[PDB]
Amino acid sequence: ADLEDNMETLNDNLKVIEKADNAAQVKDALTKMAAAAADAWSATPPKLEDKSPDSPEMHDFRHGFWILIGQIHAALHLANEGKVKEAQAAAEQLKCTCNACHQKYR
Amino acid sequence: ADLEDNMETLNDNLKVIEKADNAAQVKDALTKMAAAAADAWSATPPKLEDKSPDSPEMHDFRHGFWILIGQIHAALHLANEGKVKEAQAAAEQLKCTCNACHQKYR
Amino acid sequence: ADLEDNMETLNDNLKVIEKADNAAQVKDALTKMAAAAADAWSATPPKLEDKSPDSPEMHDFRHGFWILIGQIHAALHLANEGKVKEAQAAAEQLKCTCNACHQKYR
Numbered sequence: 556a557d558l559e560d561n562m563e564t565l566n567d568n569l570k571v572i573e574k575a576d577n578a579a580q581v582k583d584a585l586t587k588m589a590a591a592a593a594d595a596w597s598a599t600p601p602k603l604e605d606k607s608p609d610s611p612e613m614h615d616f617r618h619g620f621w622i623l624i625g626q627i628h629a630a631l632h633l634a635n636e637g638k639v640k641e642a643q644a645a646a647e648q649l650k651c652t653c654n655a656c657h658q659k660y661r
Numbered sequence: 662a663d664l665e666d667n668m669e670t671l672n673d674n675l676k677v678i679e680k681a682d683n684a685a686q687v688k689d690a691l692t693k694m695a696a697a698a699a700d701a702w703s704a705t706p707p708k709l710e711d712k713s714p715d716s717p718e719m720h721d722f723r724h725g726f727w728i729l730i731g732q733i734h735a736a737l738h739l740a741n742e743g744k745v746k747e748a749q750a751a752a753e754q755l756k757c758t759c760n761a762c763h764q765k766y767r
Numbered sequence: 768a769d770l771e772d773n774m775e776t777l778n779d780n781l782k783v784i785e786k787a788d789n790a791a792q793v794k795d796a797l798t799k800m801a802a803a804a805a806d807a808w809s810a811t812p813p814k815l816e817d818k819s820p821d822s823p824e825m826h827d828f829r830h831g832f833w834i835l836i837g838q839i840h841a842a843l844h845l846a847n848e849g850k851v852k853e854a855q856a857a858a859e860q861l862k863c864t865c866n867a868c869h870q871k872y873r
């Protein structure tokens with residue numbers, strides 16, 4: 556899919572997780588987040604289009620999505636175990652990984 | 662090798678990082694951090710000595726080390742790039758991963 | 768213990784998994800690879816015996832295992848969910864991680 560539309564998925568489901576009531580809504584949104592993060596990993600960001608796909612920048616770009624996916628995974632484990640407050644707090648801490656990448660590459 | 666000692670290695674090198682002046686020092690610290698986080702990840706913390714070796718808690722306990730080693734590696738990228746300030750800022754944000762795990766398992 | 772032996776562990780159980788018939792068998796074989804991979808994270812490969820432990824080659828090397836540990840963990844999840852076909856496929860897909868690292872470092 557699109558890297559913008561991947562980022563839309565991630566953003567929209569971060570807010571869903573914000574206002575969730577129960578565990579199934581959080582699980583639902585985290586599962587979409589993981590799939591979008593997995594598709595976004597293989598993209599070339601506009602600001603790196605001119606760089607070798609193995610430049611240190613594309614390597615660092617790829618690396619940020621591995622961290623994001625591990626964090627999504629860990630949050631989903633909380634949601635699965637029915638811990639809606641902790642799952643939501645993991646999702647909030649998630650935000651640092653988005654900001655860190657956007658600062659360098661958006 | 663002690664889990665207690667791996668955590669002092671993590672806490673001591675974190676301190677050296679934030680007090681470094683030159684990037685090679687940040688690099689050497691982070692590498693021992695990763696080696697200690699990686700030595701720690703097959704330990705069983707006090708709060709979980711009864712738990713089955715593959716209980717949900719032990720499972721999520723291992724997630725945190727994987728996330729932490731990734732984030733260290735991302736600072737090692739900044740370090741290797743001479744950028745010494747923002748490698749300290751990545752090490753700073755790192756503590757949120759420390760804290761999440763401490764708040765469940767320490 | 769040996770790096771060589773971690774590799775025979777990874778290679779034998781990859782074969783075990785292809786020929787497995789049920790989720791338990793694939794989970795047992797994945798479990799074995801997860802330990803081999805975690806063990807090998809801290810090995811020094813013969814081609815890098817002259818690199819510092821904090822070199823960018825040694826950190827890219829350990830990164831390959833960090834990735835492999837993550838991909839094994841995802842496959843282990845599928846297995847644990849009885850999805851024997853998908854988990855077997857995810858074990859197949861691991862050879863990309865293997866090949867990238869052999870190319871650079873074997």
Ligand code: HEC
Pocket residue numbers: 770771774775777778781812813828829830831832835861862864865866868869872873
């Ligand atoms: C992923 C599932 C795999 C599989 C199936 C194999 N490897 Fe590796 N490997 C790495 C290095 C540095 C070596 C050289 C070791 C040495 O010379 O002592 C190897 C070697 C092997 C072998 C042995 C081949 C031989 O002729 O001796 C085999 C069978 C093998 N590999 C299979 C490094 C890595 C990795 C670095 C991160 C990763 C990941 C893998 N290997 C993954 C796999």
Ligand code: HEC
Pocket residue numbers: 558559562563565566567569600601616619620623649650652653654656657660661
């Ligand atoms: C590289 C790692 C990376 C990570 C990790 C990441 N982003 Fe993105 N993000 C980008 C890039 C690059 C763009 C710019 C896309 C473009 O311009 O085509 C972007 C764009 C966006 C956009 C759309 C911006 C626009 O103007 O349309 C949103 C929304 C967004 N990010 C939010 C998020 C959220 C939410 C997360 C995680 C929960 C996240 N980002 C994680 C790299 C990342």
Ligand code: HEC
Pocket residue numbers: 664665668669671672673675706707722723724725726729755756758759760762763766767
């Ligand atoms: C994924 C798990 C995990 C991560 C990541 C983690 N910790 Fe620990 N930490 C623990 C546990 C469990 C203990 C309790 C060990 C004990 O009391 O035996 C602990 C204890 C500590 C202690 C007290 C040590 C002592 O002997 O009193 C300090 C300081 C510490 N952590 C700092 C850190 C730092 C610094 C980091 C990373 C930079 C970190 N922690 C990351 C699990 C973790």
Ligand SMILES: [Fe+3]
Pocket residue numbers: 628632720724840844
């Ligand atoms: Fe998991």
Ligand SMILES: [Fe+3]
Pocket residue numbers: 614618734738826827830
């Ligand atoms: Fe790297």
